[PDB]
Write a protein that binds this ligand. Sequence first.
Ligand SMILES: CN(C1CCCCCC1)S(C)(=O)=O
Ligand SMILES: [Zn+2]
Ligand SMILES: [Zn+2]
Ligand SMILES: [Zn+2]
Length: 572
Amino acid sequence: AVGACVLCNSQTSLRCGACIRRPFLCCKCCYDHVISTSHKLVLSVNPYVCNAPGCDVTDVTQLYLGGMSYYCKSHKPPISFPLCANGQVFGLYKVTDFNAIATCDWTNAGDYILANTCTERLKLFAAETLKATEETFKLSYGIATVREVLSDRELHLSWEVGKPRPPLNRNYVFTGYQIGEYTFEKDAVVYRGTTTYKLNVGDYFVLTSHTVMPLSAPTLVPQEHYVRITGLYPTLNISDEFSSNVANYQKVGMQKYSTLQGPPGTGKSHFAIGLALYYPSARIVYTACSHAAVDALCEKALKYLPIDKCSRIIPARARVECFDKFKVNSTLEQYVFCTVNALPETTADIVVFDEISMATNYDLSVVNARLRAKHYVYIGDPAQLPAPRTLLTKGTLEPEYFNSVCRLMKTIGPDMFLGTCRRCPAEIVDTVSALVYDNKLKAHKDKSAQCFKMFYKGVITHDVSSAINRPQIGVVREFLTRNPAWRKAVFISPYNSQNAVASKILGLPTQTVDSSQGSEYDYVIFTQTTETAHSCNVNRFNVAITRAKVGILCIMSDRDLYDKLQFTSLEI
Ligand SMILES: CN(C1CCCCCC1)S(C)(=O)=O
Ligand SMILES: [Zn+2]
Ligand SMILES: [Zn+2]
Ligand SMILES: [Zn+2]
């Protein structure tokens, strides 16, 4: 019941009983909370409640100290002090932003903006509060019960009346009943069991609601600039492959933490692995939020770093298949490749945290909590996609509010910028350089003359809220008959449902823009599907078109984004 003040750091016995996290508030700060909000329950060693039998007064503002006990106006003795007086709430050892964080429902962009412009203590309060609110909202959704099992990949579902149904995409992971984790896709519905189980009729599925542990470590440890490379030992012999990164590698060693903005195909992976060859004795932990991002780092390491000095950390509650070619779960290997949520408590010379636009302030804290490191390197691109904010429905989250790293990259700039895209035909590089990179991204490849745009609004149907554009898929089908080179194309759209329809009609493999991020394909077909904030989002548009190595077809709904594609237009 005794701790330090979320705002002041001041010792107190006061916690807010109304805040979902129950934060330590100092006497000056507890007042400014309770006097400005619906938050009136204060706690010290016991509740600030009226001690008179039967009395229901809990509001600290209506309470007095009578000796050692607390009483309302109705029950206080003649010799009593009000608990709230002279800007303070009585307790042992005797803010606008804290109040908005404590009380908001996290449905508004402005809530995320504040969780990222605030002081560092308040970022942790925000990130733990938000995460708590995110988890207790899962409980709101209906249970799914198996009506009839059709096949090994399809069934019919019965949905609890009175509660809403959760979106049926890969984003929403269910637990079966403990028959392992399942996903569903769109009365026939497509099921995918982590454990391949003979799905029983009357079995039920629920969204995993995991307890939110407290945060302790900052999002970013305090910045430290050094005059000399600190705690690392450079090679004199560095392979010519990594020659271009040597100055950035020296920056990494002359600061506590460094940021790298690397637009698509600028060599982020190459930078991350090349850091281990430049500091060849350094113990390096490679981390990202997703298994995919960690596995991409493993693929690069396999090529360039000694396999026997590499461990892939795999949580015993194994969900998706991942990287098999390293020793699994050897924490003390020089090179450790591990998702944020599986990190062990350990030390490192260098922590490399990849795909930083996908990280939350919660993840940033967890990393600083589990890893004691001489140097922290934050790699990604704030012009790419953030973690979905499931509670956010009003306003758009700008990249400067994605997390602490992205705020730094969008305000004071990144420490390091990889400026040459080696993946994408120049048509794409030039479009996205003007769009999100203030013309600082350069094309290494020539124009491919395999980059086409068609402005075709089509007709928008919806499976629930998920968009479908059959006519845009019809145009693609027409195009594929005349463009056989594209038979190998990956079909990409901002909507799972459009992808499910494109899958049946075209037979192309299929990706949402959000699942496409980090991957590349020779040929890409993009159907915008709809003009929504989702489909017109420049970060998502950026990721969509930078997947392509050789060609892209964009069937567009949005005049602005259509006109900005530096592509050959088609017609039909
Ligand atoms: C994250 N929590 C606080 C924030 C202040 C900085 C130190 C951690 C303790 S809380 C108030 O959410 O439990
Ligand atoms: Zn305080
Ligand atoms: Zn409160
Ligand atoms: Zn009373």
